Amino acid sequence: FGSADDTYPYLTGEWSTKFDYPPMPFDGFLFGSRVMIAKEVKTSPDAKKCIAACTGVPDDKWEQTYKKPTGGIVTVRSEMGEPIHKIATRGVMLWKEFDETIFNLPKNKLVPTLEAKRDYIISRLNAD
Amino acid sequence: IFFKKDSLWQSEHLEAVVDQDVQRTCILHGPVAAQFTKVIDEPIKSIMDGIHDGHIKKLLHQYYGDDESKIPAVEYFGGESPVDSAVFKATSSTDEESWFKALAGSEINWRHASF
Ligand SMILES: Cc1cc2nc3c(=O)[nH]c(=O)nc-3n(C[C@H](O)[C@H](O)[C@H](O)COP(=O)(O)O)c2cc1C
Numbered sequence: 410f411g412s413a414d415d416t417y418p419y420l421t422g423e424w425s426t427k428f429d430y431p432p433m434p435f436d437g438f439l440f441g442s443r444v445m446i447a448k449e450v451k452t453s454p455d456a457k458k459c460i461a462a463c464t465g466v467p468d469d470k471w472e473q474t475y476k477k478p479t480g481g482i483v484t485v486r487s488e489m490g491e492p493i494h495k496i497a498t499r500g501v502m503l504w505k506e507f508d509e510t511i512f513n514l515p516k517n518k519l520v521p522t523l524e525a526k527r528d529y530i531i532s533r534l535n536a537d
Numbered sequence: 538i539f540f541k542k543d544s545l546w547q548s549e550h551l552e553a554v555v556d557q558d559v560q561r562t563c564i565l566h567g568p569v570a571a572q573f574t575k576v577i578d579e580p581i582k583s584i585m586d587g588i589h590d591g592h593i594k595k596l597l598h599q600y601y602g603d604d605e606s607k608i609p610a611v612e613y614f615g616g617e618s619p620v621d622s623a624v625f626k627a628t629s630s631t632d633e634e635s636w637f638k639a640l641a642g643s644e645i646n647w648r649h650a651s652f
Contacts, residue, residue: 454551465571495564
């Protein structure tokens, strides 16, 4: 959610109608992303600029975050392996690549794969 | 652990990132709410008010015939949990909840809140 407008049908209870269900009204709404640009969040200048310029995507196509960048946003896994929704910056996409290549591997294949990529790994750190 | 450790704080301090390159940085955001996020550096009071205010118009139109006179009113708003002259003598057995509702009054005012 981001505006009063898209949020309204969930207040009327009219949203649930698209699915042939009785009107199903809600009591309130929370806005997480929508506020990240506000004059008073500590989000850095260049970062607010980055956030805006992300084209969104309808609920129609959010599933694609799992694979490609989708509206400028990918999922990426934390150190613990739980999914995280991040802006698809260069660093984040490296993090995603390592997520798929290096961190992916069994703890047995770790140290060998690192050494065979040491030059590459060390380079991509320094760049992105 | 060296890679992913403590990696949320750069979004807010790019002066300490390699060369202030946001493109190196973890920023969190939703794919669907991203489309509604456009107006940079807009005061938070505005964003929130923008939503409430907009809900208020749509609501007025639909169920109030755009007449603000039709909106019922009350002294102060809130304090509701999701669930002319008299004398109350009190005993051991008097229900506390019932008792206060009496002294509270039905009209929402200073005496209602006082009890
Ligand atoms: C940058 C960022 C940091 C967040 N930190 C927390 C947190 O510390 N605890 C929590 O229960 N939810 C946290 N959330 C989840 C939001 O509070 C909320 O559930 C979600 O952002 C709403 O989705 P939306 O941004 O698409 O409106 C965070 C979301 C974002 C984008």
